[PDB]
């Protein structure tokens, strides 16, 4: 059922860098994930102009933010194009290798972790606030997969023998014990207001 | 040979806004075009991981900046994925309509023309410095096309019965009489240094 993969050397090095560097402006993770959601939503919206049958798996194009104080998780849901088994494993491993090298070269030359997105490696900023990340994704042309990683050099991929979602990506952030502020309504609102105000899709913050 | 199209109402309105608004920080056009080149280069690099035969039309992934004082043109060449007849006409017309609406709504609420890229309509900033724009593009799965526009509500598309380029996009900016500074070596270098320093591809400024 569950397949285990070692991260490429440079990616594993970037994650250790993000987990061990003292950096207080951790809030940047939300903008990076929202921006990735928005790009998946654009990818599906564009593919639907030439082939209107790609919106069969969901007509609605949006982003949902779901805090869960009990489970200590923050979930970012989108109905974007989603990702295939190949994207999760190979594709987002090969494209990452290039940008990871450039970003660490930049940080060496005194750059900021807040610049991570300029290198296409914005996802890894989730390890600033999360101890484990679970990604549930579904692309039209493949099955539903669960990607998971607590860093430490490896990630797992399995078929999601769980509740089905129509086309999209659901990112589950299992927060570190001291990062519970990102489960607070006014805090999420504050971050979204200052970093993701100009997103071309509706962003709905869920209440508890 | 030559097909003439009317721009969608909102796009034609955005171009009039950019051509008529007094705005001195015109230099932003270069970053917007370079960033679009870089995204075309990423699109081809990613499509080449799953299908290595897409790099048959050129192995090299780069951006070339070519000033021509005689012709009063600045050319931005890339070897990115390129664009089809459909992209030039329909696809980049429909996706633009959404972002154009959002950007003008933002500018009404006191936003800056320098924010144009956040709306995916960064291309139209070329009309800050250019009186006419010629786009020569070539995608693997279509022929070579020439797109042209001096704004004024219309653009032209024709098959390029000219010298063939392998996969990519070549943007030719016919500069306004008072925008010749963008043909100067030190000026282009200055703009590239401060706005496009973290591009994941080699940018070569051509000498004259
Ligand atoms: C496991 C993966 C590392 N992520 C959770 S992710 O990349 O941050 C991420 C990816 C997508 C996504 N779906 N389809 C698609 O193309 N993308 C995508 C978008 C932009 C860049 C790279 C990408 F693949 C998303 O909707 C949200 C995300 O948080
Ligand atoms: C006529 C068109 C309006 N442009 C000259 S452009 O969009 O600025 C522009 C487009 C491409 C391009 N080639 N393939 C591709 O997908 N793109 C693309 C990239 C990003 C966004 C939208 C896009 F189509 C490019 O390499 C350079 C550009 O200056």
Author numbering:
A (entry chain A), B (entry chain A): 16 to 223
Please share excerpts from the published article on this structure.
Here we report the investigation of the role of protein flexibility in the modulation of binding kinetics and equilibrium thermodynamics of drug binding to heat shock protein 90 (HSP90). HSP90 is one of the most abundant proteins in the cytoplasm of eukaryotic cells, comprising 2–5% of cytosolic protein under non-stressed conditions. It is a ubiquitous molecular chaperone intimately involved in a variety of pathways, including cell signaling, proliferation and survival, and protein folding. The N-terminal domain of HSP90 (N-HSP90) contains the nucleotide-binding site, which has been the target site for drugs interfering with ATP binding and ATPase activity. The unbound N-HSP90 has a highly flexible lid segment comprising residues 107–14137.
For 7 of the 20 compounds, it was possible to obtain crystal structures of the complexes bound to N-HSP90 with loop-in and helical (8, 14, 16, 18, and 20) conformations of the α3-helix region (loop- and helix-binders, respectively). The main difference between the structures is the conformation of residues 104–111, which can adopt either helical or loop-in conformations. In complexes with compounds whose R1 substituent exceeds one atom (compounds 8, 14, 16, 18, and 20), these residues have the helical conformation with an adjacent hydrophobic pocket lined by the side chains of M98, L107, F138, Y139, V150, and W162. Steric clashes between the ligands and residues 105–107 would prohibit these complexes from existing in a loop-in conformation. All ligands occupy the ADP-binding site and form typical interactions, which include hydrogen bonds of the 2-hydroxyl group of the resorcinol ring with the side chain of D93 and with a water molecule that generally mediates interactions with G97. In contrast, for the helix-binding compounds, there is a large favorable entropic contribution to binding, and most of them have a binding enthalpy penalty. This switch in thermodynamic profile is thus directly related to the conformation of the α-helix3 region with compensating differences in enthalpy and entropy of about 60 kJ mol−1 between loop-in and helix-binders. Protein flexibility is another possible contributor to favorable binding entropy. As previously mentioned, the N-HSP90 crystal structures show higher B-factors for residues 103–111 in the helical conformation, suggesting greater structural flexibility of this region compared to the loop-in conformation. In the helical structures, however, the Q23-N106 interaction is not possible due to the binding site rearrangement, and this may contribute to enhanced flexibility of the helical conformation of the α-helix3 region. on can vary significantly, indicating transition state destabilization playing a role in prolongation of residence time. Helix-binders reach up to 230-fold slower association rates, when compared to loop-binders, indicating a higher transition state energy barrier for helix-binders, as depicted in the right-hand panel of Fig. 6.
